[PDB]
Amino acid sequence: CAVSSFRVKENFDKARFSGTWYAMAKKDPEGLFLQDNIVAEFSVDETGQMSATAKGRVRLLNNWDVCADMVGTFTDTEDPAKFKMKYWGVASFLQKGNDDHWIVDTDYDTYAVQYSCRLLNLDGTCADSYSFVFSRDPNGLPPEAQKIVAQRQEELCLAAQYRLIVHNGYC
Amino acid sequence: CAVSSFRVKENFDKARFSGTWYAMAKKDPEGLFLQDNIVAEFSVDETGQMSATAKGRVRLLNNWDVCADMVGTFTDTEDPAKFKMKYWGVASFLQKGNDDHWIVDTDYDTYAVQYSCRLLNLDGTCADSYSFVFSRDPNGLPPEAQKIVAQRQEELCLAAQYRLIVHNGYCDGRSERNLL
Amino acid sequence: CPLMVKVLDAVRGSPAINVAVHVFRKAADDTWEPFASGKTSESGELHGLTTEEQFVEGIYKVEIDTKSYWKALGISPFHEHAEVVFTANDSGPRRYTIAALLSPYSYSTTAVVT
Amino acid sequence: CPLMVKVLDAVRGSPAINVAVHVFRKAADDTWEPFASGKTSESGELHGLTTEEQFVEGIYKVEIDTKSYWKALGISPFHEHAEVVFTANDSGPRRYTIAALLSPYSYSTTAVV
Amino acid sequence: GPTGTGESKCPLMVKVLDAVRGSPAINVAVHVFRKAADDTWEPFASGKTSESGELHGLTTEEQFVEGIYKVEIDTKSYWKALGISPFHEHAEVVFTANDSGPRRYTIAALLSPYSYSTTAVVTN
Amino acid sequence: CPLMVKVLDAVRGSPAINVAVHVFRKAADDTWEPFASGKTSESGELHGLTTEEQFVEGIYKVEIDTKSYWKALGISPFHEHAEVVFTANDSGPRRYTIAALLSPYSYSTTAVVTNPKE
Numbered sequence: 001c002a003v004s005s006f007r008v009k010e011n012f013d014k015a016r017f018s019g020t021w022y023a024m025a026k027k028d029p030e031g032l033f034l035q036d037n038i039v040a041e042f043s044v045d046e047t048g049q050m051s052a053t054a055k056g057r058v059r060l061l062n063n064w065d066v067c068a069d070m071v072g073t074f075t076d077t078e079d080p081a082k083f084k085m086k087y088w089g090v091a092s093f094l095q096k097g098n099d100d101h102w103i104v105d106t107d108y109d110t111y112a113v114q115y116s117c118r119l120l121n122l123d124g125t126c127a128d129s130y131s132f133v134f135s136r137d138p139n140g141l142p143p144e145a146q147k148i149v150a151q152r153q154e155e156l157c158l159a160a161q162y163r164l165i166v167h168n169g170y171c
Numbered sequence: 172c173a174v175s176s177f178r179v180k181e182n183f184d185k186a187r188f189s190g191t192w193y194a195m196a197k198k199d200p201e202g203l204f205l206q207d208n209i210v211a212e213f214s215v216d217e218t219g220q221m222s223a224t225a226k227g228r229v230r231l232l233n234n235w236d237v238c239a240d241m242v243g244t245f246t247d248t249e250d251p252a253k254f255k256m257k258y259w260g261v262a263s264f265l266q267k268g269n270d271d272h273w274i275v276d277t278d279y280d281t282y283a284v285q286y287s288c289r290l291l292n293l294d295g296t297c298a299d300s301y302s303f304v305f306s307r308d309p310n311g312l313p314p315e316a317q318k319i320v321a322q323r324q325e326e327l328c329l330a331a332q333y334r335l336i337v338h339n340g341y342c343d344g345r346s347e348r349n350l351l
Numbered sequence: 352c353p354l355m356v357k358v359l360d361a362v363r364g365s366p367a368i369n370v371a372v373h374v375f376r377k378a379a380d381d382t383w384e385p386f387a388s389g390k391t392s393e394s395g396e397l398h399g400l401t402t403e404e405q406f407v408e409g410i411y412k413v414e415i416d417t418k419s420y421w422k423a424l425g426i427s428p429f430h431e432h433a434e435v436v437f438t439a440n441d442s443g444p445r446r447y448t449i450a451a452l453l454s455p456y457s458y459s460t461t462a463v464v465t
Numbered sequence: 466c467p468l469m470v471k472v473l474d475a476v477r478g479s480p481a482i483n484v485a486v487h488v489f490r491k492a493a494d495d496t497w498e499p500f501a502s503g504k505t506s507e508s509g510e511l512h513g514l515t516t517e518e519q520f521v522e523g524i525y526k527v528e529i530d531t532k533s534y535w536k537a538l539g540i541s542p543f544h545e546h547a548e549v550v551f552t553a554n555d556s557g558p559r560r561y562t563i564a565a566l567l568s569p570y571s572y573s574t575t576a577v578v
Numbered sequence: 579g580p581t582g583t584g585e586s587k588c589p590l591m592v593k594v595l596d597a598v599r600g601s602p603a604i605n606v607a608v609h610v611f612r613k614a615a616d617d618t619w620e621p622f623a624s625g626k627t628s629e630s631g632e633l634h635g636l637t638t639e640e641q642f643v644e645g646i647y648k649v650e651i652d653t654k655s656y657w658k659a660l661g662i663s664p665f666h667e668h669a670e671v672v673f674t675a676n677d678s679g680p681r682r683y684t685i686a687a688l689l690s691p692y693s694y695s696t697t698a699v700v701t702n
Numbered sequence: 703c704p705l706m707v708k709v710l711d712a713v714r715g716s717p718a719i720n721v722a723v724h725v726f727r728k729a730a731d732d733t734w735e736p737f738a739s740g741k742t743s744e745s746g747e748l749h750g751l752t753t754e755e756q757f758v759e760g761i762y763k764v765e766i767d768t769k770s771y772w773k774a775l776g777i778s779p780f781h782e783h784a785e786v787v788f789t790a791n792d793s794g795p796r797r798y799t800i801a802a803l804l805s806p807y808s809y810s811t812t813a814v815v816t817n818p819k820e
């Protein structure tokens with residue numbers, strides 16, 4: 001661990017990362033997060049504000065299941081990577097908040113890697129974050145990517161600490 | 172007590188009873204009932220319906236005095252005396268019902284009785300009731316009327332008990348004084 | 352206009368849209384009779400159930416279809432439906448307002464009489 | 466004391482003591498047939514209604530005479546009675562307690578399975 | 579033309595009801611507060627309920643910024659003038675707001691001498 | 703037995719287990735100063751909050767955390783917490799039972815004990 005200094009995506013480039021992305025893995029943050037059929041649509045508005053509208057199913061209240069429609073606004077910070085997000089369910093009862101939202105790596109067209117620890121363990125870079133594995137096409141990623149998304153999960157800390165997400169029509 | 176053993180006003184004329192009537196003595200029929208400052212107001216209406224709309228103060232809900240504003244319609248019968256009044260509160264929460272409402276006498280000019288039993292004794296005839304003792308001037312009746320309104324409370328199975336029907340410029344509105 | 356019927360969600364804090372409502376009137380024979388039907392709008396409300404002239408006295412029973420509202424949500428209730436039995440224009444025409452705040456396991460019903 | 470029913474006044478912030486309660490079990494012919502009954506005690510609860518093996522999965526209904534309860538109190542109510550419909554599924558938990566909060570013009574109920 | 583202009587669709591709206599008379603609570607005091615930058619409650623919006631039991635125009639869109647607010651309803655007054663010694667001194671609602679964008683809130687309170695419930699109808 | 707608070711989950715129709723509860727009693731200076739606190743057991747009830755001769759006449763506020771509860775279910779709530787202010791008068795009855803019913807956008811509350819003393 002050590003959240004800071006995790007050297008994140010380089011000369012990031014919002015726009016070029018404004019396509020569509022799909023889930024593929026996941027880190028389990030503490031609490032109730034999204035569940036499956038986790039897609040996200042990255043937009044952008046003249047102003048330079050990099051938005052991103054996720055789509056997903058979460059185990060809300062004991063049984064009941066809801067395909068929750070989410071939204072999120074991103075507010076710049078040094079590194080072109082990092083960001084500050086304030087998401088919110090187009091609909092109430094949907095966990096609103098702010099979370100770190102780096103972008104650890106991504107060729108834009110194929111794979112990417114997003115990290116986000118929101119509390120830090122006693123002075124000492126992080127203590128409980130959630131990470132997503134995104135890829136252009138919902139099928140998988142070539143041999144190259146995977147060999148990187150794999151050699152990051154080590155840098156970013158996590159190796160195997162994931163759990164691939166299905167996507168059975170539901171949202 | 173028991174019933175049908177006594178009278179009611181003869182060919183009583185509702186139109187010559189119409190005028191304001193001031194309570195003076197009551198009866199203790201089971202369950203909450205009309206407190207003090209009990210004042211009538213008996214109207215008619217072409218058809219013949221003998222209305223009435225008596226105000227009052229009631230012990231309602233523990234310790235919450237409210238000057239209740241009633242209203243009650245009347246439906247005839249066979250002896251011009253007895254009627255069939257269904258009473259309701261200009262306002263909800265105000266015990267609304269239907270009681271038998273005779274008129275045990277009077278002289279539509281100060282001092283008219285009233286009776287009402289809504290429960291009959293083991294086919295004996297009359298269990299609970301309630302009764303009021305009216306007169307048109309709130310200061311008391313002549314030595315004659317109170318003579319009768321004292322004869323008719325022994326001919327009226329259970330006519331006049333007279334609990335403290337206390338008049339005291341109470342349900343004012345210009346300064347609430349006690350209520351709404 | 353007289354009668355009205357409001358319904359709201361106590362989980363999404365939002366009106367209770369498209370919620371069937373069935374009204375019945377105790378008949379001469381202690382037997383409930385269909386008297387009105389309809390469904391809440393986009394604003395939780397359900398207008399034009401009855402006319403004053405038509406609206407006569409008698410016991411009326413509003414029956415709200417909560418159970419499929421809840422189920423169509425993807426949540427299982429504990430109540431089959433909500434019931435509201437009262438007497439009307441007992442002492443003169445009034446304009447009723449029935450509101451209902453629904454929860455999967457607990458609802459409630461108020462009544463504003465004007 | 467399963468299927469314990471309770472009642473509360475909101476107006477006298479006190480227990481609805483002596484509140485007649487009648488339960489019904491929807492019969493085969495879609496008809497309601499008495500199941501058990503009683504009155505709320507000094508504390509506003511009414512237990513000893515049924516038994517583990519009498520109480521089977523199905524559709525019963527809890528009838529709350531409330532007007533008779535405001536009627537003693539000199540208050541003429543809006544409601545005719547507070548009814549209750551729900552199905553009893555072994556599904557899992559079988560300890561049922563349907564409470565009730567009474568006021569002259571509004572009332573709310575809830576359960577705890 | 580003027581600067582700072584927009585629609586007039588009441589963002590906020592308080593509504594009080596009477597559990598004992600089945601009527602809307604009219605002439606009920608309602609003071610509103612906004613947590614300060616220093617954990618201090620500041621006065622926001624005052625007003626009493628109409629014949630409706632409704633309090634309109636307690637704030638504006640522009641003036642309603644995100645943060646926490648309060649809505650105190652002095653039930654104590656209502657019940658006493660009536661002739662009833664209530665249990666609660668008053669009814670408090672504390673919530674955040676326009677947290678994720680502006681939104682139209684409606685706070686309704688059903689009143690009862692020893693009980694009172696509150697709900698919020700809000701929509702995007 | 704002194705002041706038995708009790709919670710109820712309306713969505714789940716069960717008992718609000720593990721709900722935090724802080725109670726305050728207005729001090730001279732018009733400020734609230736901690737009086738007792740705890741958590742709702744497995745039944746959703748709170749007992750052992752004080753004693754007959756510590757629970758003195760005055761103005762008390764009860765504070766219940768609903769938000770926490772809710773986010774712990776995963777539903778975003780309306781409120782920030784539910785509060786209960788009330789005059790504890792030696793007046794007559796002194797058995798106080800404080801209950802709540804919580805749903806994501808609404809909550810009610812009642813109190814008991816009357817004045818058995820003619």
Ligand SMILES: CC1=C(/C=C/C(C)=C/C=C/C(C)=C/CO)C(C)(C)CCC1
Binds near residue numbers: 033034058070071096
């Ligand atoms: C806004 C947003 C982000 C996170 C959304 C979250 C964290 C939604 C959480 C929803 C909660 C759990 C709902 C609870 O009912 C992701 C990273 C997808 C990227 C772009 C969109």
Ligand SMILES: CC1=C(/C=C/C(C)=C/C=C/C(C)=C/CO)C(C)(C)CCC1
Binds near residue numbers: 224231258303
């Ligand atoms: C209508 C009416 C009759 C009785 C009214 C009653 C019996 C009112 C009871 C009020 C209740 C007790 C209020 C409860 O809040 C009297 C005989 C005066 C004659 C004409 C008016």
